[PDB]
Design a protein around this ligand. Structure first.
Ligand SMILES: [Zn+2]
Length: 202
C-alpha cells in the first residue's frame, strides 16, 4: 500500500451472509481490493466457510458482538461475554484473533472501552443502507462523500447493499483509490504523519 496515493477503507457490518457477503468478496477480488468485515459471532457459527474465505482473500475481520445488542444496555459482564464469545468462535474456526471491535449501533462507554482491550473501529461515512434499501441511493450517498482516508460503513446482509458495494468498489477503483483494510489505513496515516520526523534534521 502506497501512502502517497489515495486510500479508503470499505467496511462491512452484520455478516457473514453467504448470498451477499460472497458477492462482495467476489467484487473485491475482481477489482484487486480488500475490506474489513465486522462479523456477528452467531453468523460466524452458522457460516464458518465464509469467515475462512474472507481471511483467505486478504480481508481483515473485526468483532461486531455475538447477537447485536446495544452493549450499553447490558451489564459489563454481559457485554464482555458478547465480545469474548465472538472472539472464541472466530478462534475456533480459523485460529485468528481480531484486534478491532465495532460495538453495535456505535454504542460504547469508557468502562467498556477499558475492559474490552480492543481497538474500537467506527466509521466516517454511513449511507444508512438499512433505511434506504435502494442500490442507487446507497451508491450516490457513498460516492458523494468518499475521499482519501475515509472509512465507509455498509451492512453486508442486504441484496441492495451487495449490489451497491459492487458499483462502489468499481467506481472507487476507477478513481484510483487503494481499497485497504482498517489496520492498513491506520498504518498509512502513521506513515504520512511520520514525514514530520524529517523536521528534526532539516
Ligand atoms: Zn451491525
Amino acid at each position: 500500500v502506497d501512502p502517497n496515493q489515495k486510500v479508503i477503507a470499505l467496511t462491512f457490518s452484520d455478516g457473514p451472509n453467504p448470498a451477499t457477503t460472497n458477492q462482495i468478496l467476489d467484487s473485491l477480488k475482481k477489482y484487486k481490493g480488500h475490506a474489513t468485515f465486522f462479523v456477528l459471532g452467531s453468523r460466524v457459527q452458522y457460516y464458518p466457510e465464509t469467515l475462512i474465505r474472507m481471511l483467505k482473500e486478504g480481508n481483515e475481520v473485526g468483532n461486531h458482538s455475538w447477537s447485536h445488542p446495544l452493549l450499553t444496555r447490558l451489564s459489563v459482564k454481559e457485554a464482555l461475554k458478547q465480545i469474548n464469545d465472538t472472539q472464541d468462535i472466530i478462534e475456533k474456526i480459523s485460529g485468528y484473533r481480531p484486534t478491532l471491535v465495532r460495538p453495535p449501533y456505535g454504542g460504547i462507554n469508557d468502562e467498556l472501552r477499558s475492559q474490552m482491550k480492543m481497538d474500537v473501529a467506527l466509521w466516517d461515512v454511513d449511507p444508512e443502507d438499512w433505511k434506504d434499501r435502494n442500490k442507487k441511493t446507497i451508491v450516490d450517498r457513498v460516492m458523494n462523500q468518499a475521499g482519501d482516508g475515509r472509512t465507509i460503513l455498509i451492512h453486508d446482509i442486504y441484496r441492495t447493499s451487495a449490489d451497491a458495494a459492487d458499483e462502489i468498489i468499481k467506481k472507487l477503483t476507477d478513481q484510483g483509490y487503494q481499497l485497504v483494510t482498517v489496520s492498513q489505513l491506520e498504518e498509512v496515516k502513521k506513515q504520512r504523519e511520520a514525514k514530520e520526523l524529517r523536521r528534526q534534521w532539516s
